[PDB]
Ligand binder design. Structure first.
Ligand SMILES: Cc1cc2nc3c(=O)[nH]c(=O)nc-3n(C[C@H](O)[C@H](O)[C@H](O)COP(=O)(O)O)c2cc1C
Ligand SMILES: [Cl-]
Length: 308
């Protein structure tokens, strides 16, 4: 069995989506990118009410929320440009996560500064027992990409995710499978293929096809999982209505901010946002209003009473 990974996605990658992807067969779940400058201000809070581990900012906002169900499968992705700050964030979350990822697709800007990438990654590798990973974008020239990935490997990281697109490449531009294959061949660490949604990934069987075309260790899915998290289910895609209700149940059970639930459902609805249900969802001013838009009003009242 080759690993099915939920790609890190800002706003999308909150707890309900990670748990939903796990239900449908994802082996590893990356969280949304969280900026180190925000994380360093947080305190670890055990939440008995929700049975979660919360990372709470001084304004009482829960920045990251995790639970036991995903403890051995959640990869924390940080946005960082400083090694000491990166390590302090890693030290905060390491007991509640299975991996620490560094965003290098801060982000794309880091690829132009390999001394910084190297400093941050080597500091993380030496500072935590958790496997350290990074997610990169391919460089304009193959030789530069190959030198870069070898230099990153020499830091001691556990694996590398490769989005087969260059910094200036829009989602409409095709992915470079041949470049991902060149990286996988030159490295002894696992290489995770990425950048395959829509153009290559529309159904489950497409995942293994993308892995074989890139000769990679595993596949990381973003857009296709965002549109329908049941993309990870070997038996085939589940009806969207069924997936959205399953999503809302987790959003309510783990007290997800209604604007975040609304955003994730909007991403799944796509063209169906013009339907009466898509309209009810856009108008929703609370979690109860999202639930009533999807026939989960009674579930909301029952769940709420138990949590209160
Ligand atoms: C809504 C959205 C948010 C994203 N946020 C992140 C992020 O937090 N971290 C990251 O490294 N990449 C982020 N990405 C990039 C994806 O992880 C991924 O590299 C890209 O979508 C290509 O994979 P795909 O073809 O499976 O969608 C984001 C992509 C989308 C669609
Ligand atoms: Cl990216």
């Amino acid at each position: 069995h080759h690993h099915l990974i939920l790609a890190p996605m800002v706003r999308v990658g909150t707890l309900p989506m990670r748990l939903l992807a796990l239900d449908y067969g994802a082996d590893i779940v990356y969280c949304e990118e969280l900026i180190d400058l925000k994380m360093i201000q947080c305190k670890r809070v055990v939440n008995e009410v929700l049975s979660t581990v919360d990372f709470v900012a001084p304004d009482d906002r829960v920045v990251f929320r995790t639970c036991e169900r995903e403890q051995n499968r959640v990869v924390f992705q940080m946005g960082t440009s400083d090694a000491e700050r990166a390590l302090a964030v890693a030290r905060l979350v390491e007991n509640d996560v299975a991996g620490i990822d560094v965003n290098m697709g801060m982000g794309a800007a880091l690829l132009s500064d390999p001394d910084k990438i190297e400093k941050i990654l080597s500091t993380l590798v030496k500072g935590t027992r958790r496997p350290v990973t990074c997610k990169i974008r391919i460089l304009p020239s193959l030789e530069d990409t190959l030198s870069l990935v070898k230099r990153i490997e020499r830091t001691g990281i556990a694996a590398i995710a490769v989005h087969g697109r260059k910094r200036e490449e829009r989602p409409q531009h095709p992915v470079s499978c041949e470049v991902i294959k060149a990286i996988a061949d030159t490295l002894s660490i696992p290489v995770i293929a990425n950048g395959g949604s829509h153009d290559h990934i529309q159904q489950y069987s497409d995942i293994e096809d993308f892995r074989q075309a890139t000769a990679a260790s595993s596949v990381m899915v973003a857009r296709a999982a965002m549109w329908n998290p049941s993309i990870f289910l070997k038996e085939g895609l589940r009806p969207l209505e069924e997936v959205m209700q399953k999503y809302i149940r987790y959003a309510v059970q783990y007290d997800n901010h209604y604007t975040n639930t609304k955003y994730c459902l909007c991403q799944m609805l796509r063209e169906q946002l013009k339907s009466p249900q898509g309209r009810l969802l856009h108008a929703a001013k609370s979690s109860r209003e999202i639930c009533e838009a999807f026939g989960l009003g009674a579930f909301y009242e029952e769940t709420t009473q138990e949590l209160d």
